[PDB]
Design a protein around this ligand. Sequence first.
Ligand code: ZN
Length: 252
Amino acid sequence: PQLPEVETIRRTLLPLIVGKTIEDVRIFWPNIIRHPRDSEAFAARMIGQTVRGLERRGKFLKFLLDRDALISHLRMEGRYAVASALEPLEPHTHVVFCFTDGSELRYRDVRKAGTMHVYAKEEADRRPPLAELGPEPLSPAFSPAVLAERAVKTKRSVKALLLDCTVVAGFGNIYVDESLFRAGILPGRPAASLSSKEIERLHEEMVATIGEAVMHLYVYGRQGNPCKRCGTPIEKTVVAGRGTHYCPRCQR
DNA sequence: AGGTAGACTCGGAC
DNA sequence: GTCCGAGCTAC
Ligand SMILES: [Zn+2]
């Protein structure tokens, strides 16, 4: 799930779990548990806590309990569902939080790729994976000024910059390509080569792109097809270890 | 010093 | 065998 989908999960899951008390935690794929590293400690500490809130930072969900916060990343295919303990689990269910009311919060992931970290709430923001996470793209904390400052200080491409989680939170590959297209900027441009005007335009398109989605595609996955603005075939390359899609006419 | 690239994790489709 | 995408180690 991308940031807007995670925001949707946050919004929709919260009412379904708030006020419920954990009675058991069952773990079927221990590698998902990153902190405490021992899955038995992870399970033991959450028993008896009540779910109080659900927040989002970038693509991370932060489940707020009584004492602890559970920090969860779904990666590409991770999903949560709330359902009855009396019914069979869905395939690829790796972690289940059992509530005292006979319902469960279940985490599935065919790719077994997601991560879970539990810390005391007051610690979560200064420990991995939230430590160092950049500002929310839709927040005033993500500004053209901030973007420009990171851009001048690096020798990396503008695409590599936008993919950097310390620059801006949870801005996935798809939105990087779409935003760069909308801003008219080639993904392989050195970040420091962007003019002030280009930085401001890129900021504006990043906000618009991810903002509209939180509320269809110009280039991402469209290689070999006509640009929707100029008709030039979309091209695909690799930039910063990601599939990279762009119009060589609209973007400069 | 610390910015930067690589490796690592995973499974399903070409 | 690689392609895909997110987010500790060693130059
Ligand atoms: Zn075009």
